[PDB]
């Protein structure tokens with residue numbers, strides 16, 4: 001049902017995908033089955049979500065029942081930064097691929113640019129809650145990830161939560177084999193990412209917008225925090241099209257050629273979230289939405305600026 005954004009590899013990445021962070025076991029399998037039924041072909045996964053085994057089961061079912069073919073699915077996962085040491089990249093990946101019950105991933109991403117203390121404690125922190133770093137860097141990880149592409153286990157690599165400085169650091173690495181095909185970052189009307197999107201596109205890098213609905217269920221949300229779904233100015237535009245706020249928030253990215261990955265385990269909403277190809281936001285509506293930028297991050301809670309390669313303090 002989705003249109004696509006063409007990658008530099010010429011592969012076609014479906015422009016709407018299904019997010020899976022915080023999708024509980026017992027619900028994420030049904031969420032994936034409903035999404036594939038509703039036309040979704042892009043599923044966004046990660047090691048750290050600890051639910052890939054259930055996503056894998058759902059994907060397998062639907063393949064078994066002729067609902068869809070593997071080659072028409074676009075499956076993305078992410079390498080967590082406790083596994084940046086070369087040998088751990090492979091092991092972490094093997095776990096992700098075994099859990100997803102697949103023979104290859106369409107895209108494998110660096111989840112976050114800063115290396116953490118290596119190993120299977122996923123959230124190494126000091127007594128205050130500050131991240132504990134490791135010596136292996138995202139360039140060390142990328143080296144190991146490039147092997148996976150050589151071997152055909154992964155069709156393309158990308159990054160997530162990179163600023164243009166980290167992308168430059170990657171693109172400018174001498175001896176680079178594969179370039180990233182996408183940069184997955186938070187993006188919505190309160191964080192429009194104009195300069196970052198401009199930069200990525202100019203380098204042949206697509207952008208995938210995460211938390212496009214402002215992630216209203218994030219555990220750290222405070223009642224005073226901005227709420228996109230309840231924003232009267234967003235709802236105004238949705239009303240004009242007899243659509244929902246969520247549909248507007250999703251359509252916003254599609255019209256910027258930015259891939260978008262809203263999360264839901266609610267069947268009605270999973271369906272709602274992909275009914276975004278039967279309307280168009282006007283230029284005036286797009287301009288108004290863009291004007292809502294307040295450089296605001298729903299995902300900005302973690303304490304890690306004390307380590308090298310912190311992405312969020314640069315201008316873009």
Ligand SMILES: NC(=O)c1ccc[n+]([C@@H]2O[C@H](COP(=O)([O-])OP(=O)(O)OC[C@H]3O[C@@H](n4cnc5c(N)ncnc54)[C@H](OP(=O)(O)O)[C@@H]3O)[C@@H](O)[C@H]2O)c1
Pocket residue numbers: 018019020021022044045111160161184185209210211212213214215216217229244246247261262263264265266269270272273299
């Ligand atoms: N790379 C990264 O660092 C990173 C960071 C954050 C997220 N992500 C990815 O991006 C995905 C999406 O971001 P997100 O999960 O933070 O938040 P989000 O997609 O902006 O919002 C998800 C929340 O909105 C609800 N929802 C979904 N559709 C709705 C609708 N039509 N109307 C009202 N509410 C709706 C969902 O509820 P129900 O599920 O209960 O329906 C869920 O509580 C994640 O799942 C993950 O795959 C990546």
Ligand SMILES: O=C(O)COc1cc(Cl)ccc1C(=O)NCc1c(F)c(F)c(Br)c(F)c1F
Pocket residue numbers: 048049123219220301302
């Ligand atoms: O994980 C949970 O169930 C709840 O965890 C929290 C709840 C609150 Cl209110 C604040 C912070 C956390 C937290 O730091 N979690 C570890 C944690 C991350 F650090 C991270 F970056 C990713 Br991505 C994760 F997936 C992940 F789980």
Ligand SMILES: O=C(O)COc1cc(Cl)ccc1C(=O)NCc1c(F)c(F)c(Br)c(F)c1F
Pocket residue numbers: 021111112131161299300301302303304
């Ligand atoms: O990744 C997802 O899909 C969900 O994201 C989260 C979930 C939880 Cl429980 C806690 C934090 C996040 C989150 O902030 N993630 C982006 C992210 C990191 F991953 C990270 F390691 C550092 Br450090 C960051 F500062 C940060 F911004």
